[PDB]
Design an enzyme around this catalytic site. Sequence first.
Site, PDB file in Angstrom:
ATOM      1  N   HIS A 117       4.723  -0.915 -12.604  1.00  0.00           N
ATOM      2  CA  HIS A 117       4.178   0.285 -11.977  1.00  0.00           C
ATOM      3  C   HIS A 117       5.460   0.927 -11.467  1.00  0.00           C
ATOM      4  O   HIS A 117       5.086   2.141 -11.032  1.00  0.00           O
ATOM      5  CB  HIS A 117       3.299  -0.044 -10.920  1.00  0.00           C
ATOM      6  CG  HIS A 117       3.717  -0.661  -9.871  1.00  0.00           C
ATOM      7  ND1 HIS A 117       3.368  -2.041  -9.433  1.00  0.00           N
ATOM      8  CD2 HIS A 117       4.602  -0.225  -8.740  1.00  0.00           C
ATOM      9  CE1 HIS A 117       3.954  -2.235  -8.362  1.00  0.00           C
ATOM     10  NE2 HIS A 117       4.928  -1.253  -8.004  1.00  0.00           N
ATOM     11  N   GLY A 170       7.903  -0.581  -1.318  1.00  0.00           N
ATOM     12  CA  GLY A 170       9.517  -0.840  -1.636  1.00  0.00           C
ATOM     13  C   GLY A 170       9.662  -2.106  -1.833  1.00  0.00           C
ATOM     14  O   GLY A 170      10.861  -2.492  -2.444  1.00  0.00           O
ATOM     15  N   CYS A 190       7.857  -4.420  -3.950  1.00  0.00           N
ATOM     16  CA  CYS A 190       7.550  -4.680  -5.091  1.00  0.00           C
ATOM     17  C   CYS A 190       8.870  -5.134  -5.815  1.00  0.00           C
ATOM     18  O   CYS A 190       9.892  -4.640  -5.770  1.00  0.00           O
ATOM     19  CB  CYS A 190       6.883  -3.586  -5.607  1.00  0.00           C
ATOM     20  SG  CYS A 190       5.339  -3.213  -4.815  1.00  0.00           S
TER      21      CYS A 190
END
Lengths: 304, 304
Positions: free
Chosen positions: B41, B143, B145
């Site tokens: 993503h 942030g 991820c």
Amino acid sequence: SGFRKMAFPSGKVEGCMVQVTCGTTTLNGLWLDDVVYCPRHVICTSEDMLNPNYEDLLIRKSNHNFLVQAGNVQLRVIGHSMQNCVLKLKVDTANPKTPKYKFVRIQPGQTFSVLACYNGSPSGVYQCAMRPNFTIKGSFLNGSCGSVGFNIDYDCVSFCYMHHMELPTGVHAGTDLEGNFYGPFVDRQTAQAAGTDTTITVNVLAWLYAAVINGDRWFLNRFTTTLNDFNLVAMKYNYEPLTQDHVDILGPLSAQTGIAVLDMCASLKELLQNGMNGRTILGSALLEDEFTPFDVVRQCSGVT
Amino acid sequence: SGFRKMAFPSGKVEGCMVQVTCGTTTLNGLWLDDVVYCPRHVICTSEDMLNPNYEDLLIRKSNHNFLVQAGNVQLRVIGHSMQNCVLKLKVDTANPKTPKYKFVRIQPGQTFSVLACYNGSPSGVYQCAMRPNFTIKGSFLNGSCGSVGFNIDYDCVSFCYMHHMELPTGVHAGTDLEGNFYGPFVDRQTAQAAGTDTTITVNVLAWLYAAVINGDRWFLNRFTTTLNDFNLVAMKYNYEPLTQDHVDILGPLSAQTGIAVLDMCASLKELLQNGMNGRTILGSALLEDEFTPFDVVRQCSGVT
Ligand SMILES: CN1CCN(C(=O)Cc2c[nH]c3ncccc23)CC1
Ligand SMILES: CN1CCN(C(=O)Cc2c[nH]c3ncccc23)CC1
């Protein structure tokens, strides 16, 4: 979202851990620059531990009696001294992995990370608080002595604790890195009782703010209180008194949530008086006191 | 003595974290050998996130669109591929700090450490469990991820989780390091509901054993039960069913304490039926389920 008991990343400290052996006792040491720091009780026989004269015991020890191993490589000891309850072993090699560091003596209520170690090897990391009775509630087995507590500010490790002993109640006592015990404890195998383990009120309030920020709000009530009124209740429940210095420190969490500190005190007052009624806050059924206001802001803001 | 929610030492994983930027999105990557692993993503605009076609979005991306920074030094991307929900960025440099490692897909009930990271920099480490509904209850902000979950066996890091998303309930979903989500979740900004978060019964029993080993014994009762009787009670309280495989795994804790597994089940049965009556076990007012039997033996034995 979510709120966890979070330790500092331990890598900077892992790079400092070594094994110290004197005779038949092995424990951990902290290697910073060309010094290895360890508990002085490394020099004691089991017999000695009952009533040690450390200055007298140390006379019988030479540099070559202190075996310091970093990984599986021996360090050469070129000096030793006792500072309060720690030994400083001067080695001929600066630790190449020495981080930026400070030695700090923390106040009761302050949190820190512990890197539990055995034979100079890390086993795990957890978060602790210096209790108001100057104990810590750690997880330490025989061989864990010399394990250190620390905080990190960007790239600077502040060392605040070195593990020395378990009290007969299974709570933990240790020193700063100048070798001064927290609290009244002595490095002797003699029954030593801890005082009242009071709740760190400013930390509970920090954690209630953390709960609000994370959407756990059921405990917010319609009430306010005053510092004097709150403190009467705090004393009844063995909570530390709240001072205006505590209110000041909670200012940023107050501002973020729009909940006046004294309103959150009134919420806390009702939780003390009513209990949790089988409910939870941030997955806890009791009021958590080992997050500082700084801890809550850090975790809730993602500082690295 | 003492028993703490303990994370693995994080240093081996700290050495693997990098920053991945695609366009205006920065998140974390895991650098092992000459591959950087990150959530796919990373390629999405906010708009794209609502209903992404990752294969179509990826056509518009070249190696030079993936900015990989390790500390403050850029890595050269010489290849990219999508494996399930992760991107693999081939870089021209092997990570010199690559630990011995495996990729493992864990079972619900298994615990792991998370190194929460932002901009490829570690913020903290905590212990998690894969919940029976294949969520984790982490501490993750935007942030975070690409932050990873792991276990360590001596010198081998088993990577089991990579953080991808928060559900609207503030619980967390992610993948193994082959990019396969735990549970039914998809990397799309669409409302996704979690199933029943049941209690990990074998872990609660492990923790009761840990309590006995640490001197917290008030909850030990005069009763026994059977697996079938216990399971009727477990189902009533949204506890996972106990199998003979669970009893087998608890064998070493049974032997250490001399408490038959089914006796400890009968103790647990009474705690479920009676509650804690305002008492605590290992400083908790609820039954803790994020220690595995392996975790309890490890902590109680001091493995490094
Ligand atoms: C002066 N003397 C006091 C008694 N000692 C300890 O308590 C060492 C210790 C620290 N954590 C532990 N956990 C379990 C068992 C033992 C310990 C040795 C030093
Ligand atoms: C597919 N899409 C789903 C929605 N996303 C996230 O939920 C990313 C994320 C992970 N943890 C967080 N914590 C707080 C806020 C945001 C997040 C982006 C990816």
